[PDB]
Structure 1
Amino acid sequence: VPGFLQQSQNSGPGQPAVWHRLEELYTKKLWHQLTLQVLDFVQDPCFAQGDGLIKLYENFISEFEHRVNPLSLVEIILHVVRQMTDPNVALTFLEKTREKVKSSDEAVILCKTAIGALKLNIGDLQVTKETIEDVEEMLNNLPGVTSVHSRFYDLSSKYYQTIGNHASYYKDALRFLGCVDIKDLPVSEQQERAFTLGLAGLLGEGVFNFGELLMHPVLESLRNTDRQWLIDTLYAFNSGNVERFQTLKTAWGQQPDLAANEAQLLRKIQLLCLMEMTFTRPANHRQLTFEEIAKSAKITVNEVELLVMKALSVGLVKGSIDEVDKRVHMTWVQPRVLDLQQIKGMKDRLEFWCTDVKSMEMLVEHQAHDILT
């Protein structure tokens, strides 16, 4: 063991020096240096499988060290899977070691996240999907580790792999944003994940929130690397509605997913156009001609007499609709987010009216000052 670390363990440049330092930590009993510095050398991927094979020998050293499992065991397992390569039964062994030795219950939930990922690789939407449900129970309500919630997101993203349910993907990606420590995530790797998020991830019908996720800053900046026109087309479906020029562009932006759901997405933009008139314009411009709705639903004006009824049928938002000109002037609507900087919320609509009221309130006081007494 001491001899093994001194010469055989060394592989990459600087490994003999770091392993000699590791021996000093082993004698000094400084678990923290072993927990962070030794695992940091393990974190480097240049060694790949070779560090992982050494890691099994180091795991025996780690058992003597008795470093905290939530930090030490998870890092060891992260490179243990690299050593495992294809783990037909290797996965059972690593899970067995994690189950047998648990510093804390939180480490046990971390073990579950690994079990689900390994099961996902070998099997789809079976025990692994149920294990993803089990991990939700194991996580409970504790987000203090935060990285553990990211591991929980990883199985949630794995659930998106198991069933297309792009809505589940939309929820997990949002969960990842909350449980990620910050932009400390590798920017290029996240930009590459955002390239997929920009492509299939947002092309999936699961996310279309008028910028609730699309206009969120971290992902959109990473999605700038992904084709800008496709990213614009995603905003265009939600707020640009029909966006017929963008409709030609969306086929260019991503042929996969868009072509499969083009009819369904066309229906979704038609529904989006109906929601758009009421929330964006309150009264006045909210009322609009049938031909504008025909352009909004990208359908013929004669067809829109039939089409407006179908869009009205979805009834996502309760309202009042008049078919004299197909004008909206409807009641309740839910905007995913307000446009621009909420200019309507400023003196354009609100606040300015409130200023007018207090002057009239003063008129009531002037009308009857003696009565106020």
Structure 2
Amino acid sequence: VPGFLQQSQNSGPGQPAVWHRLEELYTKKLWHQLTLQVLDFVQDPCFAQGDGLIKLYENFISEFEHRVNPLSLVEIILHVVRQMTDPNVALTFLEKTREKVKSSDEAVILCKTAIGALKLNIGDLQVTKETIEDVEEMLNNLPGVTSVHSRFYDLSSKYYQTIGNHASYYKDALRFLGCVDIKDLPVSEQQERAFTLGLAGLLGEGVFNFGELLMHPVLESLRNTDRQWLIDTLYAFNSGNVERFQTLKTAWGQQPDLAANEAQLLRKIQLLCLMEMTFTRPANHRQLTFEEIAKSAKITVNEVELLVMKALSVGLVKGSIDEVDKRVHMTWVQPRVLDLQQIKGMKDRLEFWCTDVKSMEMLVEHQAHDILT
């Protein structure tokens, strides 16, 4: 057993130097500073034929030590699988590490995420959704680790790559956008990451605008690195609606995948302006006319029916349409976004209600304060 790690002690120049300490770590029988130093060598890029041979000794360690968490065993097996190049024998060994390790901390979440990360070549679609569904089910208690939820996004994003319900990708990427605390990775990756995220999130039919989360503070720095045609057209889907120049500009910027959802985006902004036209005016004065909708949406008078009534089916407005003069009577509204100047005028609309009730009610009981006693 000692000679098995002695033949692998020298991986090249400078390796036996720190390995003289590495072999002195198990002589004192401490496997933890040994864990951090070996994992550092595993994290250290190599051929790597060193970790493939020594993983049996690390397995022998896990045998009689019976303790060390499978987390480090998943971190080493994801480095070894890259050099093994065969996912099948990696699945047999990883599932072996899943069944042979048990601890108070749940090992099913880290093993299923490792299986899902190694399932990209299977290729997909067979057992994927089953184990991917099991990840977050076992993650519900108790999600205090915060580390594995990013791996849940990894297997869920690769689950989305089949396309795959675009509307769901923003929810999964939201889970990632909130999972990782500090980015600690180059923005050059996150600029296209938030780009295709903006594409799949905007082209989704379930979300017509959601201009609020477009302003989310952690993704706005990623949008600053992005070209401003995407941010400006996201403001067109935030307010707009037409703005025919910007909805075409996103076709100038992004050629693919837009040709299918282009007409869907046009329908989404045609139902988007209906809330903002009655919301922008002080009003209400919530009754509009056919000339207002047909001129703004630049659609024929026969299709404004389908237009406004589809928005009634979306749920953003409950209003009714007066078809004698072809007027449109809006009811309620769908709140979207709105600014510190609005908090100020909000205090004006409030304080006016304050002095109203204060004055009048203090006048009410001013009359009857005498007779009470």
Same fold (TM over 0.5): yes
Asked whether 1:224 is paired with 2:217, we answer no
The answer to whether the 8 Å contact 1:146/1:181 transfers is no
SS of structure 2 residue aligned to 1:248: helix
Aligned counterparts of 1:329 and 1:347: Cα–Cα separation in 2:
29
Q: Retained in 1: the 8 A contact 2:169–2:197?
A: no
Contact 1:237–1:269 (CA under 8 A) maintained in structure 2: yes
The superposition leaves residues 262-304 of structure 1 with CA deviations (integer Å, 9 ceiling, x where unpaired) of 1112111112222333445453475544333234434246754
Q: Distance in 2 between matches of 1:327 and 1:312?
A: 15
Q: Which moved more, 1:217-226 or 1:335-344?
A: 335-344
Alignment deviations for residues 10-61 of structure 1 (CA, whole Å, 9 cap, x no partner)? 4476433333332232223333323334323423446567656655654445
Consecutive unaligned residues of structure 2, counting only runs of 5 or more, are: none
Taking a change above 3 Å as real, the CA distance of residues 363 and 225 of structure 1, as seen in their structure-2 partners, is same
Tell me: CA distance 1:232–1:67, structure 2 relative to 1, closer, same or farther (3 Å).
farther
User: Are the counterparts in 2 of residues 233 and 253 from structure 1 also a CA contact under 8 Å?
Assistant: no
How far off is 1:249 after superposition? Answer: 0.8
1:299 matches 2:299: yes
**1:194 Cα deviation from its structure 2 partner:** 2.2
Indicate conservation of the 8 Å contact 2:312/2:319, yes or no: no
Q: Check 1:364–1:207 CA distance in 2 against 1; reply closer, same or farther (3 A cut).
A: same
1:299-326, Cα deviation, whole Å (9 max, x unpaired): 2467546644454454443235555777
**TM-superposed deviation, 1:218:** 1.4
Residues 142-171 of structure 1, C-alpha deviations (whole Å, 9 max, x = no match): 210111222222233233224421222111
Change (3 A) 1:278 1:251: same
Contact 2:194 2:223 in 1 (8 A): yes
The verdict on how the C-alpha distance between 1:148 and 1:53 changes in structure 2, with shifts beyond 3 A counting, is same
Distance 1:367 1:109, change over 3 A: same
Structure 2: distance between partners of 1:181 and 1:169: 20
Contact 1:35 1:67 in 2 (8 A): no
Do 1:239 and 1:276's aligned partners in 2 also have CA atoms closer than 8 Å? yes
Q: Which is greater in Rg?
A: 2
| 1:72 Cα deviation after fit | 1.5
TM-score w.r.t. structure 2 length?
A: 0.83
Aligned-residue offset at 1:334 = 3.4
8 Å CA contact 1:2, 1:23 repeated in 2: no
Give the Å deviation of 1:237.
Answer: 1.4
1:103–1:18: structure 2 CA closer, same or farther, 3 Å change rule? farther
Q: Contact 1:288–1:326 at 8 Å: present in 2 too?
A: no
Change (3 A) 1:231 1:6: farther
Deviations, residues 47-93 of structure 1 (Å, cap 9, x unaligned): 56765665565444555665632531231233133233241332222
Distance 1:130 1:266, change over 3 A: same
Q: What TM-score do you get using the length of structure 1 for normalisation? A: 0.83
Q: Deviations over 1:83-136 (max 9, x none)?
A: 332413322222222322233452222111222333343132321111111223
> What is the CA RMSD across the aligned residues, in angstroms?
3.4
In 2: Cα distance, 1:351 partner to 1:2 partner: 81
The alignment partner of 1:246 has SS state of: helix
| Maintained 8 Å contact 1:242/1:295 | no
Distance 1:287 1:99 in 2: 67
Verify the 8 A CA contact 2:236 2:246 in the aligned structure 1: yes
Identity of aligned residues (%): 100
- Is this contact kept in 1: 2:191–2:222, CA < 8 A? yes
Alignment partner, residue 155 of structure 1: 155
Moved more, 122-131 or 179-188: 179-188
SS at 1:48 equivalent: coil
- Cα contact 2:242–2:296 (8 A) shared by 1: yes
Q: Deviation per CA, 1:198-224, whole angstroms, max 9, x where unpaired?
A: 444554546554333311121231233
From the superposition, tell whether residues 8 and 73 of structure 1 become closer, same or farther in structure 2 (CA, over 3 Å): closer
Contact 1:169/1:206 (<8 A) preserved = no
Do the aligned partners of 1:211 and 1:235 also contact (CA within 8 Å) in 2? yes
For structure 1, the 5+ residue unaligned runs are none
C-alpha change, 1:264 and 1:187, in structure 2 (3 Å) is same
| Alpha-carbon distance in 1 for matches of 2:365, 2:206 | 55
Rounded to whole Å, the distance in 2 between the matches of 1:22 and 1:7 is 14
Q: 1:198 to 1:71 in 2, by over 3 A?
A: same
Instruction: Give 1:259 deviation, angstroms.
Output: 1.3
In structure 2, do the counterparts of structure 1 residues 291 and 344 end up closer, same or farther at CA, with 3 Å as the change threshold? farther
- Alpha-carbon distance change, 313 to 110 in structure 1, aligned in 2, over 3 angstroms: closer
3-state SS of 2:214 partner: coil
Distance 1:280 1:57, change over 3 A: farther
The verdict on how the C-alpha distance between 1:305 and 1:321 changes in structure 2, with shifts beyond 3 A counting, is closer
Aligned to 1:246: 246
1:221-240 CA distance string (max 9 Å, x none) = 12333322113212321322
The equivalent residue for 2:168 is 168
Worse overlay, 355-364 or 141-150: 355-364
**Are the equivalent residues in 1 in contact too, given 2:132–2:156 (CA < 8 A)?**
yes
Give secondary structure in 2 for the equivalent of 1:321: strand
Please give the per-residue CA displacement for 1:320-372, whole angstroms capped at 9, x wherever unaligned. 55557776663333324446764487235444333432222222232332245
> More displaced, 68-77 or 3-12?
3-12
Distance 2:252 2:328 in 1: 33
